[PDB]
């Protein structure tokens, strides 16, 4: 994460699909370099058709400029998270805050 910043870089990273932002807020059940699964918890869907939410998160793939584009989980296991915050980080970023 960049020391002297502008505050805008926290928006940029999450505005681009580069980082995995939580679709529905709940509690983290399983963390892994491979994936992250969260348990909906607070207010799921209309039908009681199971909570949970699995995020596969791509890793170590090539970019159009042959740059390493991979995602890393910044949230630890059994950690509560709301709707719309970074669960898995991406390339050139630091948990929501962009870092080039």
């Amino acid at each position: 994460k960049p020391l002297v910043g502008t505050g805008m870089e926290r928006a940029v990273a999450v505005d681009s699909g580069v980082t995995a932002v939580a679709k529905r807020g709940g509690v983290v059940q399983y963390v892994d370099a491979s994936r992250i699964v969260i348990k909906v918890n607070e207010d799921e869907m209309y039908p009681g058709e199971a909570g949970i939410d699995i995020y596969n998160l791509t890793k170590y793939t090539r970019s159009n400029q042959n740059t390493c584009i991979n995602q890393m989980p910044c949230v630890s296991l059994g950690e509560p998270v709301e709707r719309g915050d970074v669960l898995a980080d991406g390339p050139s970023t630091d948990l929501g805050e962009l870092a080039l």
Partner: protein
């Protein structure tokens, strides 16, 4: 010889603030020397210091360093990066293989490593992994060596282990145990004269080395290097290498280059036949009397030798010149 006055420096109180930070004070010093020895000791300490570091790591179920593993929150690259800063102090060896097995939920530190009698670990609280599911388990083999001055994996392209298995992951080496080195002159209140200074050396390491052998090894390097500043014979190199190979350079290559069966390779390794320079001048008479060497092996040898142009059981009574 009978000239000059001069004085001599000596070690005083080595204030050990922490396991990493340290302070080495040299009181018996004049004005010029107190400031001169500062840069010499500083540089030789910030670079030309020993220390141990991880070079190779072999993890089960992991081929390359760009892969992952189930139940491991950190990726292989991050795990290797954590093994980079592993404070290890080996007793009396130049290479040790630390085994690390650990399973179940929870963080895997340097404590989970099998405590060897030779290996002294400074910080067993060092984070290495973070196993998630209780059914997750890891077992890696770590290799630590004694060295000096960086030297990554890019340096050794393949000048070590002709085969070297796929699982082995090369990690860059940070040999120097010293993080930072500072020093201050300061006027010394030596209860004696009046114009003397005390070279205060502020030191910060990783705890894998003590200020005693640290400063002494440093000054030792300085002395050994100043040794060549005594006499100046201006010794030159003879050079003039010989440029006339009496025989074919291929005969200088080992039998491995023949690329034959394992049985024949073991037979040649048992009959004291290392290079092809010995196999090229060995008759079938001697090859038949070789243990576990039959028609198949003999045909194998003659084929792999004839294909390279060479023959079997020739004579070149000129073996080997001439270093």
């Amino acid at each position: 010889g009978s000239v000059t006055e001069f004085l001599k420096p000596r070690l005083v109180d080595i204030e050990q603030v922490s396991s990493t930070h340290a302070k080495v004070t040299l009181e018996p010093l004049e004005r010029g020397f107190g400031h001169t020895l500062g840069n010499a000791l500083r540089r030789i300490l910030l670079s030309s210091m020993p220390g141990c570091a991880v070079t190779e790591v072999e993890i089960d179920g992991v081929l390359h360093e760009y892969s992952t593993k189930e139940g491991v929150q950190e990726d292989i690259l991050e795990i290797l990066l954590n093994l980079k800063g592993l404070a290890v102090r080996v007793q009396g060896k130049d290479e040790v293989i630390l085994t690390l097995n650990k399973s179940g939920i929870g963080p895997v530190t340097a404590a989970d490593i099998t405590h060897d009698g030779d290996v002294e670990i400074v910080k067993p609280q060092h984070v290495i992994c973070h196993l998630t599911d209780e059914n997750a388990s890891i077992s890696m083999r770590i290799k630590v060596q004694r060295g000096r001055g960086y030297v990554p994996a890019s340096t050794r392209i393949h000048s070590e282990e002709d085969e070297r298995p796929i699982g082995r992951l090369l990690v860059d080496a940070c040999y120097s145990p010293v993080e930072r080195i500072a020093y201050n002159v300061e006027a010394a209140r030596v209860e004696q004269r009046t114009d003397l200074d005390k070279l205060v050396i502020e030191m910060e390491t990783n705890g894998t080395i003590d200020p005693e052998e640290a400063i002494r090894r440093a000054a030792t390097i300085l002395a050994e290097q100043l040794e060549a500043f005594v006499d100046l014979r201006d010794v030159r190199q003879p050079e003039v290498k010989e440029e006339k190979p009496e025989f074919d350079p291929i005969l200088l290559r080992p039998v491995d280059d023949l690329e034959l069966t394992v049985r024949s390779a073991n037979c040649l390794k048992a009959e004291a036949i290392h290079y092809i320079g010995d196999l090229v001048q060995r008759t079938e008479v001697e090859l038949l009397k070789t243990p576990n060497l039959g028609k198949k092996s003999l045909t194998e040898i003659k084929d792999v030798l004839a294909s390279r142009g060479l023959s079997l059981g020739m004579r070149l009574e000129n073996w080997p010149p001439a270093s």
